[model samples]
Target chain A: KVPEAAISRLITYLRILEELEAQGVHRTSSEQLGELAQVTAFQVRKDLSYFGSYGTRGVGYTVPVLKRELRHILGLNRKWGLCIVGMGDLGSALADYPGFGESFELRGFFDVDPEKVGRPVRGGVIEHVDLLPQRVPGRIEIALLTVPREAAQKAADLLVAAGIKGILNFAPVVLEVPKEVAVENVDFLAGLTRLSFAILNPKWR
Target chain B: MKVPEAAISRLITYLRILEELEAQGVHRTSSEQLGELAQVTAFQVRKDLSYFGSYGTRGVGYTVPVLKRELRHILGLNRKWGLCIVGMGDLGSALADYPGFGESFELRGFFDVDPEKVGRPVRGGVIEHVDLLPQRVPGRIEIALLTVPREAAQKAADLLVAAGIKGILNFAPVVLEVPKEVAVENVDFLAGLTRLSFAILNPKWR
Candidate 1:
């Protein structure tokens, strides 16, 4: 079975691959990718091999081929329409986040505050929270939740009720949802956990 | 040999699993139980635990209290840390209001160049001018969270390093260079989006 950790590594591989492409490098060996991705050569080979046969014995991997296939494998072949449920600080940051431009679009923003409603955000209007069902019913596929913990579940319920299939939750609260919908949380606390580990193990720098 | 990335990620997962067990008021948990809850093998759980001597075991399992304490010790969660959130922009402001740093990671203050934002109250801390950081930082903070744009990150980071701060959790999209003494962890919020894409797709390895 492919562990979730392996998938995360695939994302990391995709990142460095793009970096290499930007540097105008057309070819890289597993050893070179490992050096850049900071994974071991063995780990890189294992991760790539988990998906399919990739790379040749001597000539290393073809960069463009790997890039195309990874984008395909990671489901980035099609653009992903995104909706942000809160226009708060975290929400605004998510709205401005980059690096996935080729495959993701920030389509809408939903907020409860009167002061910020109907203003402006990238690629869309500042929608009221109540518009989820009416406006987001069929168009938006994924949502990034950045509302306060108290309002998180309520917003999630609205998003789910609005027919969103996936959620990228930033709120600290653990959400309860149907088993069918996939939720991935990116609480900033995860950074502190890493920070805490780094405190005890400082050699990682 | 420490697998830095894997170990860091694993520790966070351990924290969440232990948190789940603690909330349920579980008195103890076995390696098998941890493996099930944490999505790892029981053997892997035993191996990670072996890095530290060993927590007391009962009935082929370990007591929750013992395991939790050991994990806390391993992670340095026993003591509070001081941190300054720089930039006061969309990202930095989000970092300031996070849930209890009371147990660990106390907020010292926020820093920015904006004249208007300097005195504004945030969560529990006040924003200060970025220039004030040179004087106020050394004694008040241990880590700096950089939330500035990529162009400003290096200069802000230079200020941070000059002020004697050691650890940095950079949120900018650029890689930072630092002397070997400082520790840095870059959490690209964008990377997680890629993971979401894989989750939405089935054929991409699990």
Candidate 2:
């Protein structure tokens, strides 16, 4: 059972790895890797030893092999189909985000607004909320909830009904989902408020 | 002394207090008053204070001032401003993407576009390259970098310098320009990947 916190850190780590792989660094030491990743060397060794010993006593680890293993473990090796509901500014920006294609593929956008449906946004077509049941392909395991606060709950229910197992919710409100479905909330406002409080009251550190 | 991690945890506690206060329709709170605000007893609060005896115990419990003082001290409030990058996106989208305003107000975005993005949305707003530097207002901090590809490095640096940006967090492969006041660093992607790889492989954590 991988710790959820560790899994989340893996996402950030994967981003850094992709950048490193783009460069020609084909091998790296755990200490050097820890320094670059902004984590402790002990943590790096402990994390790697979980899978199996990939590093030698002194030679370090092969970069490409470790990168591949990390990607596989994070489920990034397999293509994930994603549907983004709500075509607002944030949603639209996410739709056009270049990073999504590198890991997960965006299927399409869904919204209740009639005017928005049938409109072309960033070269992608928006579909009506009603079309979700029939139009959403069965292979799409992830649903990105970008709907407004008022519509979040209902939209979530509809997505669950459409058989999405994983949800990335951007709505500020807390939500309840089925046991098997995974819901990850990205609360920008709450995060901001927390960051702001940290900024204003520094002694709390 | 309070552990650094413990200090960080108190920040979360303070945030919860603010929320609770907002919910209760309360205007102000003393240290004793805010004790319940964090779901901790007043005695526990006093015990947590052995490291820093900055609180004032008057006729009433410690005033909000004393509580705020203790909170600030625990959180490392006097740290230097953090330099941040908003990367390529819309000004509105960037603003909306993540709230960059916090203890440190120094935040700026670096946008680098390929020829293909001629009129595309870079930051919620349309792509505004370095040419628009003179018209834009300077932020509290002027660190800047390009979020474009290796091919767009020269153009991005030219724009960043023109905009008076001093620090660079370049995502592109090309080197950038800077005045004597400017500092630049490359954001290595490999660092992130190695961390993730370790996380995935860590048996103890699993």
Candidate 3:
């Protein structure tokens, strides 16, 4: 497997390629894609050639084929069923956000708050967290967790108990989960820290 | 530019490691040791800190408190940042209540077009209309978290740039182009989806 960071860079590359294809961009050289993805041309070549010989010598890569291959490599070839654990502000926004089209199917929304319970979100009703064990489909693999920090662990445990395989956490605190269960945190501190560094570091100019 | 985008991220990683060291009550740590925690070589750690130099000592190593203070100043973490969240819908409201945003970046309040949500009480402050942004925004917010729908990303961004806020944290997927002065970070779904891909691939299995 490539570096964990490579997965995200490849995702951004794929997303950019997807947009290019949408606008009728067909074939592109590694150098071209490299400039677009903000990485060195050699790094793009390395990343692309890691899995297979998708590029042609002296000619660059075919767009659609490369796109499909990247999607497959990233496990985005199929629609992912997602469950939202919190029904608070972030949860509600995520349920309503213009997500990645039909590729992401928000299958369930579970909340502990009775005020949010029985409320209608985007697709289904806001069911209690207790129902997670009973209601999770066999297909539900990815969960977007937005519960408060104090409630994060219990909510994660409930999801884990309910057979959740992967989690994207929004709570600022890091989560402790079994090795088999993968968790990713998308926190504001990380973002702010980056931006702050950007502003103070004049080299970015 | 010392790989601005990449270095900033590494700074965050470095800070996390530094915090871990501090919590462990380690008084001082060598660049070599810090490098291990940061997943970089000792020389690389020196290079990273060299950007904001006069910070680290080479021989005895860096004192944890001093290193932390230096990083905090360089990352502009010493002062508080006021934030404005556009798109008063679900995502907007979610960001308004995202508490750490308050603990870290002062959660100023919400900004939206809906008159109904305007002045509605929220965590740190009340929601203000985006229409009021052009005039009232400059002195108020340092960062704007743009979460408007895909279609409105650009228009809302125009409002953000017009306000001349320091930076923008974009939740909407569309890439908004602004003058060189404006900085924006598209942070939400990208982080989630990339992570989901890694987990699904099960890197450990390989």
Candidate 4:
């Protein structure tokens, strides 16, 4: 069985492969790929072998071929529309982000404040949270949860009711969601706090 | 024994409440109140607090300023940590001037490979070339906020490692090739997105 950590590693490998493909590097060995992805070469070989026989015995793997396979494996071959839930500081930062790449599109933006409603955000105008029922149907698949800790659960419930399949939660709180809905946390504070711990503990360094 | 990461996160959350309480002149507080605000259990709050040291009295509870001071020293937030932004891209620029980082993290250096970006002014410091990282980083900078592109990330990391950077907050998607001695905290949004994709595709995997 593939572990969730392994899935995360695959995304890292795919990113490395994309970088290699962009640099016009056609062929790469497990050692080269592992060095770029910061994983063991054996682990890279193992993952590729587990997925399929994509790499040759001594010739390594083709960059574009591996890249395409990874994209397909990660379900990034098609487009996925997404919406921003809060439109606060974090949400506004994301709405202005230029790095969502071509695979994900910002379909809509939502906020609870009436003052922020109808204001211009990237891709579209910021709408009120109450209008989620009308706006989010089959169009948006993922919701970027950037609401405050207090409003996070409420916004999540509204998004779930509006048919959001996946949530990228930025709030620090633990969100309770249904079994079918996907949740991934992009906790900046967690990273910061962890850095504090790591810095204090010299053994970990 | 080392403190668990979950407990550390809780301590930071508690520190936030302490800051808020201190602002409103709430000098004394109970674990139950802290637990309520942090959305954790009272038992958890006490356990986490006691791990650092005994800060509360039996009935009087804990003093806000005292507890806050202890938490800050434990978390190493009392002293400023020298920090740098390696990429100076959009993400890097946003964080350079962002108000949320508090005063604990001090921005010391801004670096990029592009000659055009080099010599440009950022918030506290001017942008320097990656080549000068070895000279400029040793004493002044210990941590680096790497926001370079995926292709440039490894290269930037190599420079950082050579310059004796201890910790790296990597925003780039690719895993960095750093020494085991170097601490790395990844803020990988792409990885988060991919996890979402996997979850949506295979809902029963759990």
Best by DockQ: 4
Score candidate 4 by lDDT: 0.83
- For the predicted complex of model 3, DockQ is 0.44
Across A69-128, the per-residue lDDT of candidate 4 in tens digits comes to 888878888788889988766678788888788888899999978888989976879998
Name the runs in model 2 displaced over 4 angstroms: A122-124, A198-205, B1-206
lDDT of 1 by residue, A1-205 (tens): 8788777777778767887888898888889878766679889989888889479888888888888878888888888888899888778777876544778887789899988898777777788988888867667778989887778998999998888878888776568877666788776666776776776676654
Interface RMSD of each: 3.2, 8.3, 2.9, 2.4
Q: Please report, as a residue range, the 10-residue window in candidate 3 chain B with the lowest summed lDDT.
A: B51-60
Tell me the alpha-carbon RMSD of every candidate. Answer: 4.8, 7.5, 4.6, 4.7
Which DockQ values do the candidates obtain, in the order shown? 0.37, 0.12, 0.44, 0.47
Candidate 4 Cα misplacement greater than 4 A, ranges = A23-27, A49-55, A58-62, B1-74, B86-88, B107-141, B155-164, B179-181
Q: What is candidate 2's lDDT per residue for A1-205, written digit by digit as tens?
A: 5455455445545555666778877777777767666678777777767656367767887777777877777666766667789887667766776645455677768888888788886647999888777756576777778777768989989888887766788776555677666666665434333343443444543
lDDT of each: 0.78, 0.57, 0.77, 0.83
> Alpha-carbon error at B199 in model 4, in Å?
1.2
Query: What residue runs in model 3 are displaced by over 4 Å at the alpha carbon?
Result: A57-59, B1-74, B107-134, B151-159, B174-182
Instruction: Assign candidate 2 its CAPRI class.
Output: incorrect
Top lDDT prediction, candidate number: 4
lDDT of 3 by residue, A57-157 (tens): 77888889889888887778778888888888778877877665666788889898899999987688999989987767586888889887778988899
Give the TM-score of chain B in candidate 1: 0.88
Error of 2 at B124 (Å): 13
